[PDB]
Design a protein around this ligand. Structure first.
Ligand SMILES: [Mg+2]
Ligand SMILES: [Mg+2]
Lengths: 52, 141, 100, 34, 324
RNA sequence: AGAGUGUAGCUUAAAAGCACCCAACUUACACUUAGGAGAUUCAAUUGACGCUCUGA
RNA sequence: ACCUCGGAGCAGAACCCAACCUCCGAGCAGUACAUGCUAAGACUUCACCAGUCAAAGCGAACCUUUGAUCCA
């Protein structure tokens, strides 16, 4: 199944956004727009929010 | 002063006034149909069996500036009127005529294979080096 | 579903008004008529709504429509119903702001 | 790799075969119609 | 119920049972050409258009083409896609041959005919040439629809045309400031002897173009009329205003238009100079004002509307306090 | 001997558009892209050089 | 067995509807991580709740099936 995860910005900001990834799939690292920084920055998966 | 009697509302009757101000409307519909009508002037190329022809046509359908290799004045200077050389020559002639007619901006609507065509690439290059830009400015709302 | 035409021919329509809601492309967008993600037809300008029948030339990237049109006899032309908005007001006017 | 003279000869050969098979198809069609 | 068609239904003439024996559109472009032809063709149903609407010369041409083809260098260049074309020679030849027809198209598109002669057209037989001398070394030409600044058009232009009398006129079709239909004449030479222009009768002195700021782009027309026999004719706007329509009505018996060349003028500092120095008046400034945005009639209870609904109808953005 | 007479294959086209051929992509066809070849039968609307038909 | 939603029958021609009923599938999957932010004007399952579309603008790049409040 899929799990909702909290991608947390690697830019030092507290900005986090939620994505969906397969449980069997590896932890996610993804480029995403940082509104506070106003630039695309890397985000890393921190913790599993739920299992959907 | 009688010379300063100016009407409160000006009435510019030049058909190209708002188009050149980049304020006139473009027909923004027709999404399910090709080609799009969202232009003021369009570059249309007709490649027949023997002749290659180019038109600069307003949105209303009026043909504004044409260059046909059918015409003697141009066909008397090249070998074949149905090749890349003919396309480039007609493109340069049309670019000169567009500049003399004041049409600096245009829209070109090729099919994917027309765009991939080397002759059409040469025609676009000829137009852009002649001064005509094949991309109209956005409308100002 | 409550779909169908919301503005019949001759109806005055303001920019943004939904003209027709549809599941398929029963009516096609004409002049100054945009299409939503769900094929809803809305007015891009303020004016009068007109329904016409026009020759249908599908976008070349539309593979199914291109196949349909290539499987067609040499004299046939497809027709579709199009919805246009005939704009009423001009884009604007030039007004004397100052006599410098 | 290839040179310019051989390319020109290839183009001339293509043109001459164009003419030759054009005459061939023309005469075949003439026989058909006759 | 079914009302019968009011004419030939499309795709009815070819509607035959031999579909397999009927040649088909093997390609998209042939269908596109047919569809464009059909769209151009008139129809009995409502359509988008309803609402949004010598022998020796031939022999010489054939011989010249044969010579050009026979030239092996030309064939080699063409097959190598490297040949070029003399633009100046092509321009001159086109001007002589079919340039007047294209210039008539340009005039019709620019609305010169409908706005000057109320739709009455003609053909610019004489390949007229006008050019405003910029500085001393060069001179900006005035083609059919050119773009020339009033700074470059400050002084009167040099006119050349291979012909033999002539009346030359300049109008601003849309520069009028009071009456929409009228127009301003800028300079008018009459009874031109052949080609030389300095000997022309200067009835109205030369005026540079003066398009007001933010008033758009104005179209200025050089008219040239063939003249049979001279006729006596006749810095103030009331006397510079006139209508080419009735003006040429008063002279069409002996004058016939044979030349046109027109250009577009925008605002420039020379226009400030023109308005102040010699017109002696405050220059008008125009702004393109769009109509106010449409909002539906305000409701007492704007159900399901956002809070911005009230802002859509309030006029002043500053806080108000009523009686307090 | 007489009639119809006549633009490259077709054109109530006026030197054009469709047709036509190869080269590459196709098993192949097709598409597309590159190229190729083409005519108003001879003299002043008329007469005579060629084709079809009607006879021997 | 069903109870919500969606698609088809089931309504021949705006909408609405043959409830009950017949069949199918969804409590999603894939994709992207601007698949953002804002905002005229509209639609709407006949109330409300809810649910849709969207010009212009700003910013990046260059989408195809459900569940309120409270409470944690
Ligand atoms: Mg149902
Ligand atoms: Mg409702």
């Amino acid at each position: 199944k899929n799990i909702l995860v909290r991608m947390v910005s690697e830019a030092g900001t507290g900005f986090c956004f939620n994505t969906k990834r397969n449980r069997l799939r590896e932890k996610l690292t993804l480029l995403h727009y940082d509104p506070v920084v106003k630039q695309r920055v890397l985000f890393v998966e921190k913790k599993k929010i739920r299992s959907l | 002063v009688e010379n300063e009697a100016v009407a409160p509302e000006f009435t510019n009757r030049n058909p190209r006034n708002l188009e050149l101000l980049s304020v006139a409307r473009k027909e923004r519909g027709w999404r399910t149909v090709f080609p799009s009508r969202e232009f003021w002037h369009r570059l249309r190329v007709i490649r027949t069996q023997h002749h290659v022809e180019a038109l600069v046509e307003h949105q209303n359908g009026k043909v504004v500036v044409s260059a046909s290799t059918r015409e003697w004045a141009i066909k008397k200077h090249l070998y074949s009127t149905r090749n890349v050389v003919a396309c480039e020559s007609i493109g340069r002639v049309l670019a000169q005529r567009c500049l003399e007619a004041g049409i600096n901006f245009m829209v070109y609507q090729p099919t994917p294979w027309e765009a991939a065509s080397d002759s059409m690439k040469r025609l676009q290059s000829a137009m852009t080096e002649g001064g005509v830009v094949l991309r109209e400015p956005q409308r100002i709302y | 579903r409550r779909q169908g035409i919301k503005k019949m021919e001759g109806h005055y329509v303001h920019a943004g008004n939904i003209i027709a809601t549809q599941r398929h492309f029963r009516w096609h967008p004409g002049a100054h008529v945009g299409v939503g993600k769900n094929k809803c037809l809305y007015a891009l300008e303020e004016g009068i709504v007109r329904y016409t029948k026009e020759v249908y030339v599908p976008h070349p990237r539309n593979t199914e429509a291109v196949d349909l049109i290539t499987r067609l006899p040499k004299g046939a032309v497809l027709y579709k119903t199009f919805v246009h908005v005939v704009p009423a007001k001009p884009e604007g006017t030039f007004k004397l702001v100052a006599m410098l | 790799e290839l040179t310019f003279e051989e390319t020109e000869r290839r183009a001339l050969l293509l043109k001459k075969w164009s003419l030759y098979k054009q005459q061939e198809r023309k005469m075949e069609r003439d026989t058909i119609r006759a | 119920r079914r009302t019968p068609p009011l004419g030939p239904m499309p795709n009815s003439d070819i509607d035959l049972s031999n579909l397999e024996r009927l040649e088909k559109y093997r390609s998209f472009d042939r269908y596109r050409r047919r569809a464009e032809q059909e769209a151009q063709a008139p129809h009995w149903w409502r359509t988008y258009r309803e609402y949004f609407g010598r022998t020796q010369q031939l022999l010489e041409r054939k011989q010249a083409i044969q010579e050009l083809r026979a030239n092996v260098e030309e064939e080699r260049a063409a097959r190598l896609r490297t040949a070029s074309v003399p633009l100046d020679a092509v321009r001159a030849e086109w001007e002589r041959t079919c340039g007047p027809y294209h210039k008539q198209r340009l005039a019709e598109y620019y609305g010169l005919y409908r706005d000057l002669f109320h739709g009455a057209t003609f053909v610019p037989r004489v390949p007229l040439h006008v050019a405003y001398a910029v500085g001393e070394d060069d001179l900006m030409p005035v083609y059919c629809g050119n773009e020339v600044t009033p700074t470059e058009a400050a002084q009167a232009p040099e006119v050349t045309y291979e012909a033999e009398l002539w009346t030359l006129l300049l109008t601003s079709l849309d520069g009028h400031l009071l009456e929409p239909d009228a127009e301003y004449l800028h300079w008018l030479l009459t009874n031109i002897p052949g080609n030389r222009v300095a000997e022309g009768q200067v009835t109205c002195p030369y005026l540079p173009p003066f398009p007001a700021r933010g008033s758009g782009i104005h179209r200025l027309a050089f008219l040239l009329f063939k003249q049979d026999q001279p006729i006596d004719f006749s810095y103030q706007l009331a006397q510079r205003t006139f209508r080419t329509f009735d003006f040429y009505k008063k002279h069409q018996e002996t004058m016939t238009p044979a030349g046109l060349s027109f250009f577009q003028c925008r605002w420039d500092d020379s226009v400030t100079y023109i308005f102040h120095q010699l017109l002696d008046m405050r220059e008008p400034v125009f702004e393109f004002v769009r109509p106010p945005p449409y909002h539906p009639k305000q409701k007492r209870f704007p159900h399901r509307q956002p809070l911005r609904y009230l802002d859509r109808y309030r006029d002043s953005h500053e806080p108000t306090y009523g009686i307090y």
